[PDB]
Amino acid sequence: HMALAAPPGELTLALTPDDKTLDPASLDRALAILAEHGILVLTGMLRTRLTDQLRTAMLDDLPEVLRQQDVPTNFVPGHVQQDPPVRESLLFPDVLLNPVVYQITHAVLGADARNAVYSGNMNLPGSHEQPVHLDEPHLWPGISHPPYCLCVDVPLIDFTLENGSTEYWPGSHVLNPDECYDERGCVLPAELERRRAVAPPVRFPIPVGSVVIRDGRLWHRGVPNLSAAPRPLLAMTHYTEWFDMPPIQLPDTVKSWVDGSDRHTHAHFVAGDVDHLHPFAV
């Protein structure tokens, strides 16, 4: 793998929290990056006010998550599945219904694209290496087809090579040879080494405030958190309208601004609070 000091130029667009929209040329580069590399890094998108509240909430809930009988874990120890809170005080339009994110997902997946994941990945100190996998599979074996889902990953602290910044395999999202994937979405070791020789994986620091948009079929893995502090990641995934997903449970207190929007969410609105503390753990 290649270990970098910053997000690579070829994968990165630098914004401010004031940018509501990409100019046509920025949008073209964003789509060209997603088509060729299957991963896009957008720096400077979210205000620290929002990321601080979400970091605090998830660090505060972690003790109650680790206290459960069976802690929902992804592949190997230390990679915990944890939903951020769905209380109205911590549900922010700029996170759930971000205009730049939906501009990109509308262009790739269509105007009918919808968010169907409001979850997260808590990478604990001493965590193991995940096997290289995809979060969502190709819909037929041995077939080349366009994307049907884009993962939207929101780091809630500075991600470093120390504290478990995700390993990404650029260009891996279009690879679908026969016998390549197991029931858990893990890439066959033989196919990993063939690909590694042509386009090796990358890990890079990602500053808090950034958003990562990637093809849900991109090869990646969680890696060890070698720091003394949990590394919280907030996770969303936009799908084409026709992909079967369970709805996100939201309180009906946010129905007015969520269910209005032309930035769609597959949502079920509940009276009172939702118990957020797992179907998405593999």
Ligand X SMILES: O=C(O)CNC(=O)C(=O)O
Ligand Y SMILES: NC[C@H]1O[C@H](O[C@H]2[C@H](O)[C@@H](O[C@H]3O[C@H](CO)[C@@H](O)[C@H](N)[C@H]3O)[C@H](N)C[C@@H]2N)[C@H](N)[C@@H](O)[C@@H]1O
244 binds a copy of itself (CB under 8 A): yes
Show the tokens assigned to 166.
Answer: 């995700």
Which stretch of DSSP H or E encloses residue 53? Answer: helix 48-67
Q: Give the C-alpha distances (Å, rounded to integers) separating 149 from 63, 175, 216, 282.
A: 32, 15, 5, 18
Q: Cβ of residue 272: shortest distance to a copy of itself, in angstroms?
A: 25
79 binds ligand X (CB under 6 A): yes
Question: 39 — phi, psi (to 5°)?
Answer: -150, 135
User: Based on CB atoms, which residue is closest to Ni ion, 104 or 233?
Assistant: 233
Which stretch of DSSP H or E encloses residue 116? Answer: strand 114-123
121 binds, among Ni ion, ligand Y, a copy of itself, none (CB under 5 to 8 A by kind): ligand Y
Query: Quick check: 155 and 235 in contact, CB under 8 A?
Result: no
Query: Quick check: 105 and 155 in contact, CB under 8 A?
Result: no
User: Based on CB atoms, which residue is closest to ligand X, 80 or 248?
Assistant: 80
196 three-state secondary structure:
helix
Q: Cβ of residue 173: shortest distance to a copy of itself, in angstroms?
A: 15
166 binds, among ligand Y, ligand X, Ni ion, none (CB under 5 to 8 A by kind): ligand X
Strands (E), 32-161: 39-43, 79-81, 114-123, 149-155
14 binds a copy of itself (CB under 8 A): no
Select from 2, 48, 42 the least CA-distant residue to 161: 2
Q: Cβ of residue 236: shortest distance to a copy of itself, in angstroms?
A: 18
Positions in 96-155 near Ni ion (CB under 5 A): 135
Among 99-107, 126-134, 142-150, 190-198, which window interacts with a copy of itself (CB under 8 A)?
142-150
Which listed residue (145, 184, 255, 268) binds a copy of itself by CB under 8 A?
145
107 binds a copy of itself (CB under 8 A): no
15 CB-near residues (< 8 Å, 6+ apart) = 42, 43, 44, 45, 100
Q: Cβ of residue 237: shortest distance to a copy of itself, in angstroms?
A: 14
Among 13-21, 172-180, 192-200, 216-224, which window interacts with ligand X (CB under 6 A)?
216-224
Report the interface residues with ligand X, using CB under 6 A: 74, 79, 121, 123, 130, 135, 164, 166, 220-222, 233
